Design a protein around this motif. Structure first.
Motif, PDB file in Angstrom:
ATOM      1  N   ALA A 276       0.618  -1.472   0.047  1.00  0.00           N
ATOM      2  CA  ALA A 276       0.078  -0.043  -0.029  1.00  0.00           C
ATOM      3  C   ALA A 276       0.551   1.126  -0.016  1.00  0.00           C
ATOM      4  CB  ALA A 276      -0.901   0.052   1.108  1.00  0.00           C
ATOM      5  N   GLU A 297     -12.623   0.170   1.855  1.00  0.00           N
ATOM      6  CA  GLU A 297     -12.486  -0.626   2.766  1.00  0.00           C
ATOM      7  C   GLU A 297     -11.964  -0.301   4.085  1.00  0.00           C
ATOM      8  OE1 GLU A 297     -10.706  -4.158   1.099  1.00  0.00           O
ATOM      9  OE2 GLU A 297     -12.505  -4.404  -0.416  1.00  0.00           O
ATOM     10  N   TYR A 298     -12.330  -0.938   5.131  1.00  0.00           N
ATOM     11  CA  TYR A 298     -11.682  -1.011   6.328  1.00  0.00           C
ATOM     12  C   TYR A 298     -10.247  -1.097   6.536  1.00  0.00           C
ATOM     13  CZ  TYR A 298     -15.886   1.596   8.450  1.00  0.00           C
ATOM     14  OH  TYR A 298     -16.733   2.502   8.755  1.00  0.00           O
ATOM     15  N   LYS A 299      -9.326  -0.637   6.890  1.00  0.00           N
ATOM     16  CA  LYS A 299      -7.970  -0.786   7.235  1.00  0.00           C
ATOM     17  C   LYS A 299      -7.891  -1.405   8.708  1.00  0.00           C
ATOM     18  CE  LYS A 299      -3.258   0.354   6.463  1.00  0.00           C
ATOM     19  NZ  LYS A 299      -2.994  -0.603   7.697  1.00  0.00           N
ATOM     20  N   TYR A 300      -8.370  -2.669   8.767  1.00  0.00           N
ATOM     21  CA  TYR A 300      -8.084  -3.461   9.904  1.00  0.00           C
ATOM     22  C   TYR A 300      -6.784  -3.504  10.806  1.00  0.00           C
ATOM     23  CZ  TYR A 300     -12.858  -4.677   8.906  1.00  0.00           C
ATOM     24  OH  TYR A 300     -13.976  -4.703   8.199  1.00  0.00           O
ATOM     25  N   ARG A 304      -1.755  -9.666   9.087  1.00  0.00           N
ATOM     26  CA  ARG A 304      -1.930 -10.256   7.609  1.00  0.00           C
ATOM     27  C   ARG A 304      -1.966 -11.714   7.932  1.00  0.00           C
ATOM     28  NH1 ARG A 304      -0.624  -7.310   2.195  1.00  0.00           N
ATOM     29  NH2 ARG A 304      -2.163  -8.127   0.699  1.00  0.00           N
ATOM     30  N   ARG A 320       2.807 -11.726   6.330  1.00  0.00           N
ATOM     31  CA  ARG A 320       3.164 -10.842   5.143  1.00  0.00           C
ATOM     32  C   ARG A 320       4.818 -11.128   4.692  1.00  0.00           C
ATOM     33  NH1 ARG A 320       5.273  -4.806   4.227  1.00  0.00           N
ATOM     34  NH2 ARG A 320       3.501  -3.652   4.890  1.00  0.00           N
ATOM     35  N   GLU A 352      -6.929 -10.493   7.227  1.00  0.00           N
ATOM     36  CA  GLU A 352      -6.378  -9.734   8.455  1.00  0.00           C
ATOM     37  C   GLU A 352      -7.108 -10.670   9.539  1.00  0.00           C
ATOM     38  OE1 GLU A 352      -5.103  -6.384   7.972  1.00  0.00           O
ATOM     39  OE2 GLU A 352      -3.834  -6.740   9.627  1.00  0.00           O
ATOM     40  N   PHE A 391     -10.465  -9.943   2.222  1.00  0.00           N
ATOM     41  CA  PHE A 391     -10.833  -8.928   1.511  1.00  0.00           C
ATOM     42  C   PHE A 391     -10.083  -9.078   0.061  1.00  0.00           C
ATOM     43  CE2 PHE A 391      -6.914  -8.440   4.219  1.00  0.00           C
ATOM     44  CZ  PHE A 391      -6.080  -8.281   3.213  1.00  0.00           C
ATOM     45  N   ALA A 427     -14.535  -7.753   4.424  1.00  0.00           N
ATOM     46  CA  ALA A 427     -14.371  -6.389   4.947  1.00  0.00           C
ATOM     47  C   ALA A 427     -15.248  -5.524   4.303  1.00  0.00           C
ATOM     48  CB  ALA A 427     -13.027  -6.217   4.377  1.00  0.00           C
ATOM     49  N   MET A 454      -8.558   1.345   3.137  1.00  0.00           N
ATOM     50  CA  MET A 454      -7.839   1.042   2.229  1.00  0.00           C
ATOM     51  C   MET A 454      -8.748   1.454   0.733  1.00  0.00           C
ATOM     52  SD  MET A 454      -4.896  -0.537   3.067  1.00  0.00           S
ATOM     53  CE  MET A 454      -3.794   0.062   1.598  1.00  0.00           C
ATOM     54  N   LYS A 456      -8.464   0.749  -3.177  1.00  0.00           N
ATOM     55  CA  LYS A 456      -8.222  -0.211  -4.484  1.00  0.00           C
ATOM     56  C   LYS A 456      -8.973   0.294  -5.468  1.00  0.00           C
ATOM     57  CE  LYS A 456      -7.558  -3.032  -0.366  1.00  0.00           C
ATOM     58  NZ  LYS A 456      -7.850  -4.667  -0.183  1.00  0.00           N
ATOM     59  N   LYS A 475      -3.688   3.684   1.146  1.00  0.00           N
ATOM     60  CA  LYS A 475      -4.123   3.833   2.556  1.00  0.00           C
ATOM     61  C   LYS A 475      -4.516   5.199   2.918  1.00  0.00           C
ATOM     62  CE  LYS A 475       0.280   3.440   3.543  1.00  0.00           C
ATOM     63  NZ  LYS A 475       1.521   2.752   4.708  1.00  0.00           N
TER      64      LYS A 475
END
Ligand SMILES: *OP(=O)(O)OC[C@H]1O[C@@H](n2cnc3c(N)ncnc32)[C@H](O)[C@@H]1O
Length: 632
Positions: A276, A297-300, A304, A320, A352, A391, A427, A454, A456, A475
Motif C-alpha cells: 500500500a 475498505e476498512y483498514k483493520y 495479515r 506478510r 487480516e 478482502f 471487509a 484502504m 483499491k 491507505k
DNA sequence: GCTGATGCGTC
DNA sequence: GTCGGACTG
DNA sequence: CAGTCCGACGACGCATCAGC
C-alpha cells in the motif's frame, strides 16, 4: 587472481575477466571484491550491472554456485517459510570478533559502537581460501546450532570463518552476521542483476559459452528496454514463487523465457503480498484514481494472514513475509470448513487476523492480538480469540486469480465464501467517488476501530501482479485526513550512536515527558526518524555540547536502554505518532492509566524543534495520560 | 528450575 | 511500522 | 515532479539460551 577480480570493469568478459577456473568452486573473495565495487558506487544501475558481471561468470563458469552467491548478496540463509535464523546477536558476534582479533571485548566493542560498523573492527598457517559456497553453508551451520550451550558453538564457526578470511573478506563476513551488510542492493536489484546475467550470458551452453553478450549490437537505450522486459519476467515469477531454491534450478534448467511455464502459483507455497501507498487525504486519492473506478475498505488493525487451502484438505497460513504462521492459529484451521462452500476444492485467501471479544463482541486492540503464543496450537489454551477479515482471493479451485481484476476477484470471493460474525467475515467495503461520502466512511472506519481506509481500484490497473506495482493499494490514515494526529513536545534526554548511514553521528534519541507531581522528566520513547540529513547533522552539533557523564536526578529511564550519551535536558522536540500503548519499559505516566505500565508512542517521528520551549513546559505525563485516556 | 537479556517477527 | 535521499524515468 | 528502492530508525511480546 581473485584479489584483482574486478566486476566493475569495462568490456567485462565473463570467461576472461573471471578469476576462477571453469567448473571450479566460486571463491568468496570474488564475492567480496564485487561487494567492494558496488559499494564504491551510487548509481543503482551501475551497481546492478556489476552484480550482473559476477553472476554471468557464475552461470557461465560454475552454475551450482549461483544460488549460494545470490543468497550471499541477499544476505539470507534461505527461503522465508523455512525460517532459518542466524541466532547470533550483536554481542555474540562481538565476542567472536574480540577472540579472533586477539583483542578485549571492550576495545573491540567501543570501536564498533563508534565507527558504527563491525566490519572494520573485524580486520602461522592460514586455511585454504574461502569459498563462496562454503561461507554460505557455514552460515547455515551457525543457524542450525540451537538449544543449550549452542552459542559457544556458534562462536567457534565465526572465529574460524574470520581466521580464514583473506583480504576484505573479514569486513563483509562481519557485516553479514551483524545483519548489516549495507550493500545498497536488496531483493529488487539482486533480482534485476540475476535477470540481466541470465539474459546476457544464458545458462545451458557447453563451455566456453558461444554466446556471451546477447545484448551486443543493441544501442544503449535499446539494451535498457530489452533488459527491463526480461526483468519483469523473472520479477513477476519470483513474486508468485518467491523462493530461490525453486526458481533457480528451473531458471538454470529452462531459461528465463520459459521460466513461468515451469514455475507456478500453488497453495502451500506463500506468494508475495500486495502492498500500500500512503495518501495525504481524500483529495489525492481521488486524483490518483481520477480515471479509475475504485472501492473503499476498512483498514483493520490486526496482522495479515494468507490462508492456503490445499485440495487434499490441509491448510497453511502465512505472514506478510512468507513466514509460516500455521501453528499460531489452530483455531482458524478448524473453522476453515465452515468458511467455504462445498464446491470450493482449494483457495488462497487474503485476510487480516483480528483480536476478538467473543463476549463483548468487538474488535480488541492490536496489542491484545500480540499476546497469543506463537508456537503451540494448544487450541484450548487460546486466551485471545481471533476474527479473520477477508478482502481478497488470489486463487480458487485449481486456478490462479492473479491476473484478474479486483472486481472479478472480490465477486468470486463473496460468491463462494460464507461469513460468520466474529469468526470469518468480508471487509466492509464502500463503492464511491464522493468526497464527503469517503470522509464519512473514514470516520466510521476509525469509529469501528480501523487504522482507516484502504483504497483499491476495481478493474483498472487492478490485478494481483505485484511486479508491476506492489504498493498498488492506497491507505487513508486518520493522521492527516484528520488534519494532524497525536503530536507531543518532548525533551531530549540522551543520544544513541548511529550506524551505517547514521554512522559517525547520532542515530537516535531518548525522549521524556514532564511529570510535575514527581517534578522529573520521564523517558517516554526513542526517536530515530523524521529528521533530514542536514537536520541531523545540525542536531549532532548542538546536543554534542550537552553530553553529561551522568544523568540528572530528575531524569527517570527504567527498562529504557541507557542512552549512549546522557544529554543535558534542554532540547524540546515536537513528535507525531499513530497511537499510544502501555509500555512495560517506560516510566512516563506510570500509575496514571496502569498501576504498573507507563505509556509510549507508536510510530514516533520527529517533526521539528520547538526552540521556545523549556523541558518543564514540555508535554506532561497526565497530558499523555490524557491522550492515552482519550484513545478508547 | 528461574531470572534477565536479547533474538526475531509483528505492526 | 516510519522516515529521507539518490537515482531514474 | 513521482515513483523505485535501500537502509537508517520505532514499541512490543513471545521465544530462547546463559548463568545462576
Ligand atoms: O500500513 P501498511 O502499509 O502496513 O498497510 C497494509 C496492511 O494493512 C492491512 N489491512 C487491513 N485491512 C486491509 C484491507 N481491507 N485491504 C488491504 N490491507 C488491509 C494488511 O495487513 C496490509 O498488509
Amino acid at each position: 587472481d581473485p584479489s584483482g577480480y574486478n566486476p566493475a570493469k569495462n568490456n567485462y568478459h565473463p570467461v576472461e575477466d573471471a578469476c576462477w577456473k571453469p567448473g571450479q568452486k566460486v571463491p568468496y573473495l570474488a564475492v567480496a571484491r564485487t561487494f567492494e565495487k558496488i559499494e564504491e558506487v551510487s548509481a543503482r544501475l551501475r551497481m546492478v550491472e556489476t552484480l550482473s558481471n559476477l553472476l554471468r561468470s557464475v552461470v557461465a563458469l560454475s552454475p551450482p554456485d549461483l544460488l549460494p552467491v545470490l543468497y550471499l548478496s541477499l544476505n539470507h540463509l534461505g527461503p522465508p517459510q523455512q525460517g532459518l535464523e542466524l541466532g547470533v546477536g550483536d554481542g555474540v558476534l562481538l565476542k567472536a570478533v574480540a577472540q579472533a582479533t586477539g583483542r578485549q571485548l571492550e576495545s573491540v566493542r567501543a570501536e564498533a559502537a563508534e565507527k558504527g560498523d563491525v566490519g572494520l573492527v573485524a580486520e602461522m598457517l592460514p586455511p585454504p581460501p574461502l569459498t563462496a559456497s562454503g561461507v554460505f553453508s557455514k552460515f547455515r551451520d551457525i543457524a542450525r546450532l540451537t538449544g543449550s550451550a549452542s552459542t559457544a558453538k556458534k562462536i567457534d564457526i565465526i572465529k574460524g570463518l574470520f581466521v580464514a578470511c583473506r583480504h576484505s573478506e573479514a569486513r563483509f563476513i562481519a557485516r553479514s552476521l551483524s545483519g548489516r551488510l549495507r550493500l545498497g542492493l536488496a531483493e529488487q536489484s539482486v533480482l534485476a542483476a540475476l535477470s540481466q546475467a541470465v539474459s546476457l550470458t544464458p545458462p545451458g551452453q557447453e563451455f566456453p559459452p558461444a554466446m556471451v553478450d546477447a545484448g551486443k549490437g543493441k544501442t544503449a537505450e535499446a539494451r535498457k528496454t530489452w533488459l527491463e522486459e526480461q526483468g519483469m519476467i523473472l520479477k513477476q515469477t519470483f513474486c508468485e514463487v518467491p523462493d530461490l531454491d525453486r526458481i533457480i534450478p528451473v531458471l538454470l534448467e529452462h531459461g528465463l523465457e520459459r521460466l513461468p511455464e515451469h514455475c507456478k502459483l500453488s497453495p502451500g507455497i506463500p506468494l508475495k503480498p500486495m502492498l500500500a501507498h500512503p495518501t495525504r487525504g481524500i483529495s489525492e486519492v481521488l486524483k490518483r484514481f481520477e480515471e479509475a473506478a475504485f472501492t473503499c475498505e476498512y483498514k483493520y488493525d490486526g496482522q495479515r494472514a494468507q490462508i492456503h487451502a490445499l485440495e487434499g484438505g490441509e491448510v497453511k497460513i502465512f505472514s506478510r513475509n512468507q513466514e509460516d504462521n500455521t501453528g499460531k492459529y489452530p483455531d482458524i484451521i478448524s473453522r476453515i470448513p465452515k468458511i467455504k462452500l462445498p464446491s470450493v476444492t482449494s483457495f488462497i485467501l487474503d485476510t487480516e487476523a483480528v483480536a476478538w471479544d467473543r463476549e463483548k463482541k468487538q474488535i480488541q486492540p492490536f496489542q491484545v492480538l500480540t499476546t497469543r503464543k506463537r508456537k503451540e496450537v494448544d487450541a484450548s489454551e487460546i486466551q485471545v480469540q481471533v476474527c479473520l477479515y477477508a478482502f481478497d482471493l488470489i486463487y480458487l479451485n485449481g486456478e490462479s486469480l492473479v491476473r484478474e481484476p479486483l472486481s472479478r476477484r472480490r465477486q468470486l470471493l463473496r460468491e463462494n465464501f460464507v461469513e460468520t460474525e466474529g469468526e470469518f467475515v468480508f471487509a466492509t467495503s464502500l463503492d464511491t467517488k464522493d468526497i464527503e461520502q469517503i470522509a464519512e466512511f473514514l470516520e466510521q472506519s476509525v469509529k469501528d476501530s480501523c487504522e482507516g481506509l484502504m483504497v483499491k481500484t476495481l478493474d483498472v490497473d487492478a490485478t494481483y501482479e505485484i511486479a508491476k506495482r506492489s504498493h498498488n493499494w492506497l491507505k487513508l490514515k486518520k493522521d492527516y485526513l484528520d488534519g494532524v494526529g497525536d503530536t507531543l513536545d518532548l525533551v531530549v534526554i540522551g543520544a544513541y550512536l548511529g550506524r551505517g548511514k547514521r554512522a559517525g553521528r547520532y542515530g537516535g534519541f531518548l525522549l521524556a515527558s514532564y511529570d510535575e507531581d514527581s517534578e522529573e522528566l520521564q523517558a517516554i520513547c526513542k526517536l530515530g526518524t523524521g529528521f533530514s540529513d542536514e537536520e541531523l547533522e545540525e542536531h549532532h552539533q548542538s546536543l554534542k555540547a550537552l553530553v553529561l557523564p551522568s544523568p540528572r536526578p530528575y531524569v527517570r529511564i527504567d527498562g529504557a536502554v541507557i542512552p549512549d550519551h546522557w544529554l543535558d535536558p534542554s532540547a524540546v522536540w515536537e513528535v507525531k505518532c499513530a497511537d499510544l500503548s502501555l509500555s512495560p519499559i517506560y516510566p512516563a505516566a506510570r500509575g496514571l492509566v496502569d498501576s504498573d505500565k507507563g505509556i509510549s508512542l507508536r510510530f514516533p517521528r520527529f517533526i521539528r524543534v520547538r526552540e521556545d520551549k523549556q523541558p518543564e513546559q514540555a508535554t506532561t505525563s497526565a497530558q499523555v495520560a490524557c491522550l492515552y485516556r482519550k484513545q478508547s
